[PDB]
Amino acid sequence: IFSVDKVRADFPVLSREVNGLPLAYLDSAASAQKPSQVIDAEAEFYRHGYAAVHRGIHTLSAQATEKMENVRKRASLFINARSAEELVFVRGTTEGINLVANSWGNSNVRAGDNIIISQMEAHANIVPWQMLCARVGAELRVIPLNPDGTLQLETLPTLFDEKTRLLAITHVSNVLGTENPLAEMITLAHQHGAKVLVDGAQAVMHHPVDVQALDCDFYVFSGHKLYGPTGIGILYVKEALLQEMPPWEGGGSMIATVSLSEGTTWTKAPWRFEAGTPNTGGIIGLGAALEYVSALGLNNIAEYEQNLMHYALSQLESVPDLTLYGPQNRLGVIAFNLGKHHAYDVGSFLDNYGIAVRTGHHCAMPLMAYYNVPAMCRASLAMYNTHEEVDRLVTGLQRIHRLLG
Amino acid sequence: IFSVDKVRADFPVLSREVNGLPLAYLDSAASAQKPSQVIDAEAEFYRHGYAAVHRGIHTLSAQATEKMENVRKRASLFINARSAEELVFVRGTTEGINLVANSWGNSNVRAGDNIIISQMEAHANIVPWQMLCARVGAELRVIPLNPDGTLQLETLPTLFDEKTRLLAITHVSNVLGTENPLAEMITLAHQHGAKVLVDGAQAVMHHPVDVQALDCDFYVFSGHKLYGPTGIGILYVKEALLQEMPPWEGGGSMIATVSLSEGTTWTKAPWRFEAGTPNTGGIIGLGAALEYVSALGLNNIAEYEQNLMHYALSQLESVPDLTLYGPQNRLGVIAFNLGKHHAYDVGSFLDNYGIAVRTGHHCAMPLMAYYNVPAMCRASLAMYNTHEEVDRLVTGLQRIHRLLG
Ligand SMILES: Cc1ncc(COP(=O)(O)O)c(C/N=C(\CS)C(=O)O)c1O
Ligand SMILES: Cc1ncc(COP(=O)(O)O)c(C/N=C(\CS)C(=O)O)c1O
Ligand SMILES: [Cl-]
Numbered sequence: 001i002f003s004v005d006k007v008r009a010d011f012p013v014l015s016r017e018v019n020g021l022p023l024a025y026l027d028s029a030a031s032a033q034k035p036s037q038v039i040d041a042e043a044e045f046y047r048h049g050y051a052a053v054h055r056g057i058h059t060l061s062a063q064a065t066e067k068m069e070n071v072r073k074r075a076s077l078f079i080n081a082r083s084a085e086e087l088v089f090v091r092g093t094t095e096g097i098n099l100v101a102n103s104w105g106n107s108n109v110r111a112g113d114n115i116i117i118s119q120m121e122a123h124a125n126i127v128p129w130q131m132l133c134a135r136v137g138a139e140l141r142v143i144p145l146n147p148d149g150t151l152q153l154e155t156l157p158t159l160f161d162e163k164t165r166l167l168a169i170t171h172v173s174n175v176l177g178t179e180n181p182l183a184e185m186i187t188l189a190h191q192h193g194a195k196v197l198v199d200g201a202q203a204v205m206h207h208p209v210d211v212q213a214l215d216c217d218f219y220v221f222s223g224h225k226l227y228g229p230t231g232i233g234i235l236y237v238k239e240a241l242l243q244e245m246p247p248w249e250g251g252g253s254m255i256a257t258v259s260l261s262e263g264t265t266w267t268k269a270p271w272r273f274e275a276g277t278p279n280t281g282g283i284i285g286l287g288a289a290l291e292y293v294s295a296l297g298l299n300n301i302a303e304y305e306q307n308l309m310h311y312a313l314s315q316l317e318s319v320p321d322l323t324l325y326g327p328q329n330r331l332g333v334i335a336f337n338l339g340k341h342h343a344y345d346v347g348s349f350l351d352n353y354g355i356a357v358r359t360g361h362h363c364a365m366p367l368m369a370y371y372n373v374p375a376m377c378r379a380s381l382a383m384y385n386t387h388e389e390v391d392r393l394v395t396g397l398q399r400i401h402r403l404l405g
Numbered sequence: 406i407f408s409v410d411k412v413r414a415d416f417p418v419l420s421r422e423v424n425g426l427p428l429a430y431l432d433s434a435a436s437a438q439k440p441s442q443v444i445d446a447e448a449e450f451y452r453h454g455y456a457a458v459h460r461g462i463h464t465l466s467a468q469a470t471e472k473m474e475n476v477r478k479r480a481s482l483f484i485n486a487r488s489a490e491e492l493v494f495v496r497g498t499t500e501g502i503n504l505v506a507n508s509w510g511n512s513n514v515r516a517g518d519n520i521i522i523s524q525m526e527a528h529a530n531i532v533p534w535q536m537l538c539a540r541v542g543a544e545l546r547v548i549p550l551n552p553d554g555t556l557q558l559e560t561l562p563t564l565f566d567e568k569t570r571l572l573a574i575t576h577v578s579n580v581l582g583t584e585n586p587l588a589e590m591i592t593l594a595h596q597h598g599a600k601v602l603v604d605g606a607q608a609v610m611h612h613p614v615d616v617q618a619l620d621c622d623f624y625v626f627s628g629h630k631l632y633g634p635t636g637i638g639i640l641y642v643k644e645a646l647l648q649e650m651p652p653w654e655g656g657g658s659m660i661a662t663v664s665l666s667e668g669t670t671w672t673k674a675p676w677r678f679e680a681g682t683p684n685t686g687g688i689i690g691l692g693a694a695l696e697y698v699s700a701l702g703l704n705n706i707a708e709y710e711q712n713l714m715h716y717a718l719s720q721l722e723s724v725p726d727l728t729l730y731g732p733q734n735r736l737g738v739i740a741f742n743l744g745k746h747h748a749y750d751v752g753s754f755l756d757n758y759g760i761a762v763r764t765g766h767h768c769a770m771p772l773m774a775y776y777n778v779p780a781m782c783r784a785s786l787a788m789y790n791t792h793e794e795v796d797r798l799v800t801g802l803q804r805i806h807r808l809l810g
C-alpha cells in the first residue's frame with residue numbers, strides 16, 4: 001500500500017497558499033510538482049560536482065560524464081529498453097518528435113506515401129507530421145474518434161495500405177485520459193512495414209511502460225511531467241533504426257571530425273543526436289525523479305490514482321449540468337464543461353478558491369473541434385492529490401453553478 | 406574594486422577536493438561554476454512557485470509566465486537590445502546558431518551566394534553553415550589566421566562581394582582568447598548587404614556587451630558559461646529580421662491554430678521559436694546569474710581578469726619549452742603545449758595535482774590544423790580564480806617538464 005500523506009510531505013509546493021487559501025494543484029498533466037529528492041539532487045550536483053561533460057580529462061568532468069551515462073542507463077531500465085544506447089536526451093516530448101520527423105522522416109517518407117495520426121493527438125504529435133508531409137509531398141491520414149473518446153478502430157483498414165510509412169499515436173490522451181490499444185495497433189502497423197512512434201508524455205507517470213512488450217519503434221516522454229526538472233526528455237528508438245538515422249542538429253559533440261576542406265563526419269548514435277552542451281542539471285534531476293518514482297512503485301501509484309479517479313467521477317455526478325468528455329476508464333485527467341459557462345470563467349472561479357485546473361484547448365484543437373466546443377476545463381488527479389481536493393473541486397463547481405446559473 | 410575572496414565564497418564547488426588536493430578549476434571556458442545565488446534561485450522556484458507557463462489561468466501558472474518574461478526583459482537589458490521581444494530562449498549557443506541557419510538561412514541564402522566564417526570558429530559556428538551550404542548549394546568562405554592568432558583582415562576584399570549573404574564570426578575565441586574587431590567588420594559586411602551573426606559564447610562574461618553599438622544582426626551565448634544553469638541560452642535577433650523569419654521547431658505554444666483540414670498558423674516572434682515546454686528552471690537560474698554578474702559589475706570583472714591574465718602570462722615565462730598560442734592581449738583563456746609532450750598527458754598530470762584544465766581539440770579542429778598540432782592544453786582564468794591558482798599551474802608545468810623531460 002501507498003501513503004498519500006507521506007508522499008505529499010516530499011513536495012514543498014503543496015504547502016503553498018494561493019489567493020489566501022491552501023493550494024489544490026490539479027494541473028499535473030500540464031506539469032508536475034517535484035519532490036525535494038529531485039530538487040536537491042540537481043542542486044547538490046551544482047554545489048559539489050559540476051563540470052563540462054565531454055569525456056574531459058579532469059576528475060569533475062570525468063565523473064560528470066559518468067553520472068550522465070548512468071542516468072541514460074537508469075532511463076533505459078525504467079522503460080525496459082534493451083540497451084541504454086537506444087535512448088537519446090532531448091529537451092522534451094516536442095523536440096523528440098521533431099527529431100524523428102526530420103532525421104528519420106526525411107529519408108523514409110517519400111512522395112505518395114502516407115502517415116497516420118489520430119484525432120486526439122496533441123499538437124506536438126501533429127505539426128511535425130504536417131510540416132513533414134509538406135516537405136516530401138505525402139498524405140497525413142487521421143484516425144477519427146467515437147463520442148466516448150475512443151478511437152474508431154473500424155476505420156483502420158481504410159487508412160493502412162502498402163504506402164503507410166508511419167503511425168504516430170498517443171499512449172494516453174492529455175484531455176480524454178483514453179489509453180489506446182498500442183500493442184495491437186503496433187502489430188497491425190508492422191504487418192504493412194510501417195513504423196510506430198508512441199507519444200508517451202501522459203503515460204510514464206501512471207503505470208509501468210515496457211517498450212519491448214509494446215514493440216514500438218519510437219517512444220517519447222518529458223521529464224517535467226514525470227516529477228522531474230524542465231528542459232529534459234527521453235526519445236527511445238530501436239537500435240536497428242537508430243543506427244541508420246542521419247543527423248539533425250549540428251555542432252560540437254555530435255561531430256567526429258570537422259574539416260574546412262574535407263567536410264565533416266558524425267559520431268555514433270545516440271550521441272550523434274545530442275549537440276552542444278547537454279542539460280546536465282536536468283539530466284541529474286531526471287535520474288532522481290526516476291529513482292523516486294521507482295521507490296514508490298508504479299503499480300502502487302496506478303492503484304492509488306485509479307481509486308482517486310473512481311472517487312472523483314462518482315462525486316462529480318452530484319454537479320448539475322456537468323458535461324464530461326472521454327471514457328469511463330480514463331487515466332490521469334478529467335475534462336469537463338459546466339453548463340453553458342465559458343471554461344475560462346469556470347477555471348477563474350476555481351483559481352479564486354485556490355484550485356488550479358487548466359482551461360483552453362489543451363494543445364489539442366482538432367479534439368476540441370470534434371466535440372464542437374472551443375475549450376474545456378481539465379483537472380489532473382496525480383499521486384499526490386487527495387480525496388479532500390476532489391471534494392473542494394466538487395463543491396467549487398456546485399457553487400459556480402449556483403452563482404452563475 | 407573587486408574582492409576575489411568575497412566572490413569565491415559564493416561558489417560552493419570551489420571548496421571541493423580532487424585527488425585529495427584542493428581543486429583549482431581552470432576550465433570555465435568549457436563551463437562555469439555557479440554561485441549559491443543561482444543554485445538557490447532555481448531551487449526556490451521549484452520549491453514554492455512551480456507550474457506550467459503557458460499564460461495558464463491559475464495563479465502559479467500566471468506568476469510563472471510573468472517570471473519568465475521578466476527574465477527575457479532582464480536579458481535584453483544585459484546586452485542592451487532595444488526590445489525584449491528581440492530575444493529568443495534556446496538550449497544554448499549551438500541550438501541558437503542552428504535556428505538562424507535553418508529559419509533565416511534557408512530563405513535568404515540561395516545557390517551561388519556565399520557565407521563567410523573565420524578559421525578560429527568553434528564547431529558550433531561551422532557545421533550549421535556547412536550543412537546549410539550543402540542544402541542551398543552556396544559557398545562557405547573562410548577568413549584565415551595570422552601566426553599570432555588574429556584574423557588576416559587583409560583578405561576581406563577577396564571574400565566579400567555582392568553575393569555575400571552572411572558573416573558568422575566569433576566575438577572571442579574559445580582557444581586563442583583573441584577578441585575580434587566586430588564593430589568594423591560589421592560595418593564592412595553591411596556595406597554589401599550581408600547580415601552578421603556574432604558567436605558571443607566567450608564574450609558575455611568578460612566585459613559589457615552592447616548589441617546596439619555593435620549593430621550585429623544576430624548574437625548568441627550560453628547560460629552555463631555565464632555562471633548560470635545548463636540547458637538555456639539567448640539568441641538576439643534584430644526585430645526587423647526576426648519578424649520576417651519562418652518557423653523551425655514545430656508544436657504547441659508556437660502555433661496560433663492547428664487544423665487537420667485547414668493546416669496550421671504560427672504565433673509572433675519571439676514565441677514562434679519556443680516550442681513545447683520552456684526550460685523554466687533554467688530561465689529562472691539564468692535570470693539570477695545575470696543579476697549576480699551585474700551586481701559585481703562587468704567592468705570590475707574585466708579589470709580583475711585582465712590583471713590575473715597579465716600575471717599568469719608573466720609567470721608562465723619561467724616554464725621551459727612552453728609554447729603559447731594566440732595574441733598577448735587575450736581574454737579568458739591560455740592555450741599552450743609543453744615541449745613535445747601530448748596535451749592529454751600534460752592535462753592528466755595537472756589533474757593529478759588537483760588542477761582542472763581542458764585538453765584536446767576544443768571543438769576547433771580547423772584551428773588546430775592551422776597550428777599543425779592535433780591538440781592543445783587550455784587554462785581558463787575566470788573571475789573566481791586566484792594568483793595562487795596560477796602559481797600552482799606554473800609549478801605544475803615545471804614539475805611535469807622535469808619529470809617527463
Ligand atoms: C500527449 C502530449 N504530448 C506531447 C506534449 C508536449 O510535451 P512537452 O511540452 O514537450 O513536454 C504534451 C504536453 N502537455 C500538454 C500539452 S500543452 C498538456 O497540458 O496536457 C502532451 O500532453
Ligand atoms: C566560441 C564558442 N561557441 C559556441 C560554443 C558552444 O556552446 P554550447 O555548448 O552550445 O553552450 C562554445 C562552447 N565552448 C567550448 C566549445 S567545446 C569550449 O570548451 O571552449 C564556444 O566556446
Ligand atoms: Cl566537438
Ligand SMILES: [Cl-]
Nearest residue numbers: 123363657658
Ligand atoms: Cl498550443
